[PDB]
Design an enzyme around this catalytic site. Structure first.
Site, PDB file in Angstrom:
ATOM      1  N   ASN A 186       0.817  -1.231   0.000  1.00 21.73           N
ATOM      2  CA  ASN A 186       0.000   0.000   0.000  1.00 21.73           C
ATOM      3  C   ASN A 186       0.851   1.282   0.000  1.00 21.73           C
ATOM      4  OD1 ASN A 186      -1.784  -1.812   2.479  1.00 21.73           O
ATOM      5  ND2 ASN A 186      -2.421  -1.682   0.322  1.00 21.73           N
ATOM      6  N   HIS A 188       3.214   2.205   2.045  1.00 14.07           N
ATOM      7  CA  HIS A 188       3.514   2.678   3.394  1.00 14.07           C
ATOM      8  C   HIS A 188       4.827   2.023   3.827  1.00 14.07           C
ATOM      9  CE1 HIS A 188      -0.186   4.741   4.598  1.00 14.07           C
ATOM     10  NE2 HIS A 188      -0.731   4.017   3.617  1.00 14.07           N
ATOM     11  N   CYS A 223       6.542   7.169   9.136  1.00 18.04           N
ATOM     12  CA  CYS A 223       7.556   7.859   8.342  1.00 18.04           C
ATOM     13  C   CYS A 223       7.028   7.775   6.906  1.00 18.04           C
ATOM     14  CB  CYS A 223       8.930   7.196   8.481  1.00 18.04           C
ATOM     15  SG  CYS A 223      10.178   7.743   7.267  1.00 18.04           S
TER      16      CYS A 223
END
Ligand SMILES: Cc1c([C@@H](C)NS(C)(=O)=O)cnn1C
Ligand SMILES: Cc1c([C@@H](C)NS(C)(=O)=O)cnn1C
Lengths: 264, 265
Positions: A186, A188, A223
């Site tokens: 995704n 991330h 992050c």
């Protein structure tokens, strides 16, 4: 892998790969953390997940890790077969917990254990929330109802409060940036990358003379792909360290943690 | 995995993992490259190595990759089973070659192929050298004697000479550093990390709208654990081709050069 007889837990066997091991020819803690994630994903798939439930997809909710705690007694060697058993438990309105047990397939002995706390979050606003009855009902059917803890001991390391490291740090590794391989499907940053970044500020001599026995990590903020991170470490002691990951610029906290190392 | 009936090649099946896939839920080229290296390592172990031969250990010699060439037709999806067949061939005194064939376990069709050129080097001085008869006799018994090429075509991309990118680069990704996870069991940077670093200077829009079909990488020098790398890319072209260069951030010393070919989704 497969669900166990009662359908309330999942097991999978893994053969440790050549690129998965470090200088001692045994799996790194990051390889262990990747395997825990894989067996977790395989468990969710086996019980009908597409781990968002039907109600979670409707209210745009996702599970996010708040805390990860891992204890390794023996790291499996390159070519060894490790068997991992995983299960999840409802923690009332607070969230959910996923536990793991690592075993040597040949001897049958427990070589490690892990526990993780997950909380609900709206995937768009990033606002945390409690677990509602409608969502609790659609996942309780996949959990043991009586408590089953990988870390049962009353007052164990998995539930300890972690303080915030104060400047100046004893050691540091600055300018850490994720590359595409550090991202999940995704886009991330994978949770395992943060374990790697925490460890980067441990001096090489400690890594060369000690084995990591316990790691506890608190996740505060994500992050992003264009963010830059500083990794900070201070000896608090076996050797124990206090850790802090923060953004390179404004110093915004992303993670805090502790590690315990044993002399070889 | 296991050696085939004739004992001249090795096969292994892999189930693609959740963390091994990208945005399209298919294996990244780095996951493919890691699997190629795992099946290569399992082949060396099955035929008695630990691929350093007996004479190589005596003369303090190692095999080092000079070139890696990968072509993917279909990337396996998360949960899919991919079967990889690998074999080695002697290339006279120049060095050795390792080839791979990737197949979908369910359909049996070829979904990818790879080839790699390896050269002998003294582990300490880092000086290259030709393959002696003594070393060649210790590994010829594990190779097919007649040629067996993953890339047989008489004018194919695996043997093309790659030019050096000229400044200014069209795109760049600066300050790349290896972390402990990028190192192998001997504390050297894994060859797959260089593939990742090369790809870092490709813009995200190209990655989001195209699939990587071919990657050719030349290895010139190793990146040490305390080195910092710059990744440079320039478009050279329904298909996009790029020229790549990895160099040390400071002195600009070349570590790798390569080319990629991308097809529109
Ligand atoms: C917001 C968040 C957390 C939560 C659980 N941490 S917090 C702020 O509650 O301390 C974990 N990952 N992310 C992105
Ligand atoms: C030294 C080296 C090479 C050789 C083949 N390149 S070279 C010397 O011909 O430029 C490949 N990887 N490494 C570390």
């Amino acid at each position: 892998g497969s669900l166990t007889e009662d359908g309330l837990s999942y097991k999978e066997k893994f053969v440790v790969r050549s690129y998965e091991v470090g200088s001692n020819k045994t799996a790194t803690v990051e390889t262990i953390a990747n395997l825990l994630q894989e067996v977790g994903c395989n468990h969710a798939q086996s019980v009908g997940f597409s781990a968002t439930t039907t109600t979670m997809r409707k209210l745009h909710l996702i599970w996010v890790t708040a805390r990860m705690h891992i204890e390794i007694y023996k790291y499996p060697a390159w070519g060894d077969v490790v068997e991992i058993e995983t299960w999840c438990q409802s923690e009332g309105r607070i969230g959910t917990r996923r536990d793991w047990i690592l075993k040597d397939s040949v001897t049958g002995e427990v070589t490690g254990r892990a526990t993780s706390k997950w909380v609900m979050m709206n995937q768009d606003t990033r606002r945390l929330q409690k677990v509602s009855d409608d969502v609790r009902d659609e996942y309780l059917v996949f959990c043991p109802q009586e408590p089953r803890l990988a870390f049962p001991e009353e007052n164990n390391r998995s539930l300890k409060k972690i303080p915030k490291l104060e400047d100046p740090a004893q050691y540091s590794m600055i300018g850490l940036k994720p590359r595409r391989a550090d991202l999940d499907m995704n886009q991330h940053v994978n949770n395992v990358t943060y374990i790697g970044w925490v460890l980067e500020s441990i001096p090489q001599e400690i890594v060369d003379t000690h084995e990591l026995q316990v790691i506890t990590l608190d996740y505060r903020r994500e992050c992003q792909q264009d963010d830059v991170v500083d990794s900070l470490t201070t000896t608090t002691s076996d050797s124990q360290f206090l850790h802090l990951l923060r953004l390179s610029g404004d110093g915004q906290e992303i993670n805090r943690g502790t590690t315990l190392w044993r002399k070889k």
